[PDB]
Amino acid sequence: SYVPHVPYVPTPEKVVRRMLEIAKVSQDDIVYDLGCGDGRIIITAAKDFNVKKAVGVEINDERIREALANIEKNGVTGRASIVKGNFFEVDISEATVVTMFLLTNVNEMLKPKLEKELKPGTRVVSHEFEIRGWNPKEVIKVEDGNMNHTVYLYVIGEHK
Ligand SMILES: Nc1ncnc2c1ncn2[C@@H]1O[C@H](CSCC[C@H](N)C(=O)O)[C@@H](O)[C@H]1O
Ligand SMILES: [Mg+2]
User: Fold this and answer.
1) Domain 1-160 classified CATH 3.40.50.150?
2) Does 9 count as an annotated binding residue?
3) Hey, whose CA ends up nearest to atom 8 of ligand 1?
4) Which residues hold their Cβ within 5 A of ligand 2, which is an ion?
5) Is 158 annotated as a binding residue?
């Protein structure tokens, strides 16, 4: 379709693990990755963090096939799934943890949806990009070799 430009660029695995640690993801959680790419975040959530449910939303068909293929080869089909669609339109209200690696302007556009649909205490973790106008509970630097990454953690209902 015709959604704001957000190309496929994945979060490095070390940053993926740190985003989930920072949000304190556990078995009780329901993790949504908005724009899931190859599915690495929801697969790590299910496989390493034992989450009861992980859902990736993805609009690109080639990416959906890779993600579904990755879910199968990791054996997590029970708990991890993909929703084909525009993340702007898909209901994310069941999420207890939402992960994002998008763009600051796309973060901006998502602000009404996040506030509308997410319950208080929902944690939202963003790789690299700020949610402008919100106050993060934490801002963390993650070193992956000689690369530095910033991770933002917000908590719905304590973000303003
Ligand atoms: N409006 C939209 N709805 C669903 N997916 C989208 C989207 N806009 C971009 N995407 C997808 O979101 C992905 C962003 S790349 C980030 C992938 C993953 N969250 C990670 O951190 O590794 C791309 O695969 C792109 O196809
Ligand atoms: Mg980065």
Assistant:
1) yes
2) yes
3) 6
4) 128, 149
5) no
Q: Please give the resolution of this entry in Å, rounded to 1 decimal.
A: 1.9
CA dihedral 80, 86, 88, 94 (to 10 degrees): -20
Q: By C-alpha distance, which of 112, 157, 106, 158 is closest to 127? A: 106
Domain ranges of the chain: 1-160
- The secondary structure element, H or E, covering residue 43 is helix 40-49
Q: What are phi and psi of 75, to 5 degrees?
A: 70, 15
Complete DSSP assignment for 100-139: E-S-HHHHHHHHHHHHHHPPTT-EEEEES---TTS--SEE
User: Of 146, 139, 103, which Cα lies nearest the Cα of 18?
Assistant: 139
Beta strands in the chain (DSSP E): 30-34, 53-58, 80-84, 97-100, 123-127, 138-144, 147-155
